């Protein structure tokens, strides 16, 4: 055995060591951070909860977050051009241009898109020189029914203007380069020395089996929903009936085997308008029984009290209600002595003594 | 409009022309055939090595060609590569995020790609002159997430995806070429041939169809099961495609003969499928299930060779070397064990 | 398909011949024809290309300004011209063909590589 | 511009290296062609990684950076040619000086 790859070796060993340190720092703050999800019927209500909980950031705020940006817009820059020429490709009509080198700069920038480099003067006068035909705007009138990044002549316009170099654009460029909705966003924020991290759901399906599965790992779940929705129209059919649906989504999570110890927090967004149309229109759609009293106050009492006791004999879980605030201050409260309470319940398992 | 009903009538006639031709391929007895083989006899494997490292579970795990490097991927956030024949570390990689559903491994051995809930497949470069691990690319454009993915060659990878699409991929261009269209459930799993002509897509409508790469048409569709398909396996000449399934039964079915040929279960066996894998001879058979039971099965005679147990937690991951020497298995015990 | 040389032979100083490859069961309009130089004792050389749909095509550096090239795409038959030749430009001409654009024929995956090689035929120049 | 190859010989079964290196950053666009007198050139490998179809699972191939790496395990007697390193990146088209393999006696 040699010396050296031995050295190697016990070298793998000891950068084995650095691996470990990476996972202990990793796992210690892993360990010790506060997982909670997110779900929700409406749009509008965690929207409004999520945007009022956003704190105001600046797009532009650093120069590696603009070297980032560079390479995306270079990336929807090529891919968009890309996906125009084979979008024409795709056409059955004979759609070529009138200028044949252009089809040699053509091909040429479909060797260029594999480079990892920067971006060069002859590649952008490529996509501006063939970008000056009108019919490749017909082809966007065409392709507009297509897969498509919808602002993509805006990207070849600044791309334009982004030819001179040492150019810093404003934030819409960024911002607007972000809208899109696919994927699960996450969000850290501190309150109160406690660090939180939200996993929404893009709504992406009905029906859940695998990554419902997978979120198993939890500390407490946020429950949103509209009480409005009896009044609010979501409907295909003559039935309109979203608290079925959404009552179906609370008995699917509360009945699913997987998260038999956790607790669900559970919020009511709209209220105002939901008093203007108590004194407009009687709740006698949904059960006679549940409208036996005529009076305002006790009609949310009704409310919690089905969703309360559509818990399925089961004591080691209890159900919070909480109502809407002018200030997202009280409500960040709410969230943090209950998450506080239920790890002091937990703690109190764990210990041995309840 | 009614039209629709009278093709409909026509694809019935077309139907009973395949249970007649089935029934025609169906006369002789496999009864018989396996009967005229000599038994094996019981199997005893022994675990020589364990692996460490992970604070979660195990979702990922796949073989290198080169029957050294071994790759397993966590859900806490972080890739590592394995050397089995030592117990050494090669590299640790950190990713976006921590939703971790697939992995995968180069038969050249240069890249390592993953992917997850995040809609997005990156691809890592693993020999850079620098000393680290890169991200190259992102590949974007599916909506729902992608179950399983697995590279044909170097410069064009195929992926399955929720939208209940299956696409090809190009590496350089970052844009997809063709795409495949015609289920209605969720795609659950890939597996392609050792020739890379023909890889088959499971979903969750119980059925399978066999797509082709170079002219994008399903030739021939299975039918047949009860319940949701989990894991894919190829015979090592390509002739044979055995199918797991949610109801605790594994079949196998022929491109050749269009029939179904033999099914595997047992009256004390009722919890599921969770990943399925041949041997290079192709007379074994192996599968994970829910309640911590290995059970290898003889293909040929239908009858169990041997038991394997020693995990604590649901087993996720299987898979044979190339090399055939060895079988490593994954669990949500954060422990990887080695069957020799 | 097959790829076949016409119009060679042993040619003197100061002549001319005109040296032609037919094309037999493509299309012709969306492929590009190539010739090569096989000098004796060492490797290949690549000297003209006939570009069918833009029309402009390449020249070696040493050779552009004596050849000149045209082709005819109805009848599947490209020609070369060759003119002012030298002592040492005998060489074995192949007939090879490579495709520029592979989707606008139809969607296939990208390819860098000469296809189809003819036979090739033996061109001298002696006194 | 050239590039520059280089030559080795082995005996039965034994891995070949074959090395051609670019003078500038050019794309994947990379060809090898086997050439044995009497026949004409055979396409192997295109785009420099990808293997034409009908070729066996001896042949492999990288690219990293401008460096293009050829690999044949497993030799076979029949497989004794030149092989040649081919650019298509430019309408300029650059062929390579070739290499060599013969058997170890």
């Known amino acids: 055995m040699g010396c050296t790859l031995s050295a190697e070796d016990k070298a793998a060993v000891e950068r084995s060591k650095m691996i470990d340190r990476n996972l202990r720092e990793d796992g210690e703050k892993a360990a010790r951070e506060v997982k909670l999800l997110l779900l929700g019927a409406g749009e509008s209500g965690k929207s409004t909860i999520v945007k009022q909980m956003k704190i105001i950031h600046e797009a532009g705020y650093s120069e590696e977050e603009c070297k980032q940006y560079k390479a995306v817009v270079y990336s929807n820059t090529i891919q968009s051009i890309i996906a125009i020429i084979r979008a024409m490709g795709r056409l059955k009509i004979d759609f070529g241009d009138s200028a044949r080198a252009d089809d040699a700069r053509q091909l040429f920038v479909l060797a260029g898109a594999a480079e990892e480099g920067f971006m060069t003067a002859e590649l952008a006068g490529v996509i501006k020189r063939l970008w000056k035909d009108s019919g490749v705007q017909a082809c966007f009138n065409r392709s507009r029914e297509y897969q498509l990044n919808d602002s993509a002549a805006y990207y070849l316009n600044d791309l334009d203007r982004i030819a001179q170099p040492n150019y810093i654009p404003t934030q819409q460029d960024v911002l607007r380069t972000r809208v899109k909705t696919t994927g699960i966003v996450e969000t850290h924020f501190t309150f109160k020395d406690l660090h939180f991290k939200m996993f929404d759901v893009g709504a992406q399906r009905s029906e859940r089996k695998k990554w419902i599965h997978c979120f198993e790992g939890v500390t407490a779940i946020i429950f949103c929903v509209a009480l409005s929705d009896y009044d609010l129209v979501l409907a295909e059919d003559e039935e309109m009936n979203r608290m079925h649906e959404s009552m179906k989504l609370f008995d699917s999570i509360c009945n699913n085997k997987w998260f038999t110890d956790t607790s669900i927090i559970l919020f009511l967004n709209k209220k105002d308008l939901f008093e203007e149309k108590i004194k407009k229109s009687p709740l006698t759609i949904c059960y006679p029984e549940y409208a036996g009293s005529n009076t305002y106050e006790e009609a949310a009492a009704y409310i919690q009290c089905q969703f309360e006791d559509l818990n399925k004999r089961k004591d080691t879980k209890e159900i919070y209600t909480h109502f809407t605030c002018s200030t997202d201050t009280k409500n960040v409260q709410f969230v943090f002595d209950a998450v506080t309470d239920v790890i002091i319940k937990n703690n109190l398992k764990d210990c041995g003594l309840f | 409009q009614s039209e629709l009903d009278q093709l409909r009538q026509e694809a019935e006639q077309l139907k009973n022309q395949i249970r007649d031709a089935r029934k025609a391929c169906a006369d002789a007895t496999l009864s018989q055939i396996t009967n005229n083989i000599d038994p094996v006899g019981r199997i005893q494997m022994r675990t020589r090595r364990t692996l460490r490292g992970h604070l979660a579970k195990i979702y990922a795990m796949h073989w290198g060609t080169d029957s050294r490097l071994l790759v397993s991927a966590s859900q806490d956030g972080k890739l590592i590569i394995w050397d089995s024949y030592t117990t050494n570390k090669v590299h640790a990689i950190p990713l976006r995020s921590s939703w971790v559903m697939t992995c995968a491994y180069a038969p050249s051995g240069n890249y390592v790609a993953c992917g997850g809930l995040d809609n997005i497949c990156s691809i890592y470069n693993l020999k850079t002159r620098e000393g680290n691990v890169r991200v190259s690319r992102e590949l974007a454009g599916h909506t729902g997430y992608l179950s399983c993915c697995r590279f044909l060659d170097d410069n064009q990878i195929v992926t399955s995806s929720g939208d209940t699409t299956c696409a090809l991929w190009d590496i350089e261009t970052g844009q997809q070429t063709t795409t495949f269209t015609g289920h209605t459930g969720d795609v659950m799993s890939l597996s392609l041939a050792p020739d890379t002509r023909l890889f088959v897509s499971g979903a969750c409508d119980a059925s399978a169809k066999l797509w082709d790469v170079r002219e994008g048409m399903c030739r021939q569709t299975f039918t047949g099961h009860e319940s949701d398909i989990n894991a894919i396996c190829f015979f090592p000449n390509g002739n044979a495609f055995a199918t797991g399934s949610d109801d605790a039964t594994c079949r196998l079915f022929d491109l050749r003969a269009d029939q179904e040929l033999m099914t595997y279960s047992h009256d004390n066996i009722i919890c599921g499928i969770t990943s399925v894998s041949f041997s290079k001879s192709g007379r074994l058979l192996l599968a994970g299930y829910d309640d911590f039971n290995c059970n290898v099965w003889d293909a040929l005679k239908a009858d169990r060779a041997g038991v394997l147990a020693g995990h604590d937690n649901r087993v996720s991951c299987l898979g044979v070397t190339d090399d055939g020497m060895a079988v490593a298995t994954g669990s949500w015990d954060s422990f990887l064990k080695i069957w020799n | 398909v097959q790829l076949v040389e016409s119009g060679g032979g042993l040619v003197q100083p100061g002549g001319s011949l005109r040296l032609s490859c037919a094309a037999s069961?493509?299309?012709?309009?969306?492929?590009?024809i190539h010739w090569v130089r096989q000098a004796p004792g060492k490797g290949l050389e690549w000297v003209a290309s006939?570009?069918?749909?833009?029309?402009?095509?390449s020249y070696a550096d040493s050779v552009k300004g004596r050849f000149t090239i045209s082709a005819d795409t109805s009848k599947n038959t490209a020609y070369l011209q060759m003119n002012s030749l030298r002592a040492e430009d005998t060489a074995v001409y192949y007939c090879?063909?490579?495709?520029?654009?592979?989707?606008?024929?139809?969607?296939?995956?990208?390819?860098?590589?000469?296809?189809?090689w003819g036979q090739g035929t033996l061109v001298t120049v002696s006194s | 511009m050239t590039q520059s190859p280089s030559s080795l010989s082995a005996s039965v079964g034994d891995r070949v290296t074959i090395t051609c290196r670019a003078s500038?950053?050019?794309?994947?666009?990379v060809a090898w062609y086997q050439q044995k007198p009497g026949k004409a050139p055979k396409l192997l490998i295109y785009?420099?990684?990808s293997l034409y179809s009908g070729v066996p699972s001896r042949f492999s191939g990288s690219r990293s950076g401008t460096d293009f790496t050829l690999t044949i395990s497993s030799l076979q007697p029949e497989d004794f040619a030149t092989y040649y390193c081919?650019?298509?990146?430019?309408?300029?088209?650059?062929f390579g000086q070739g290499t060599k393999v013969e058997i170890k006696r």
């Open positions: 090879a063909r490579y495709p520029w654009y592979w989707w606008m024929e139809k969607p296939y995956l990208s390819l860098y590589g000469m296809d189809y």
């Open positions: 069961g493509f299309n012709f309009y969306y492929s590009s």
């Open positions: 006939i570009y069918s749909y833009s029309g402009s095509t």
């Open positions: 500038q950053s050019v794309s994947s666009a």
């Open positions: 785009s420099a990684s």
């Open positions: 081919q650019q298509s990146s430019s309408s300029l088209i650059t």
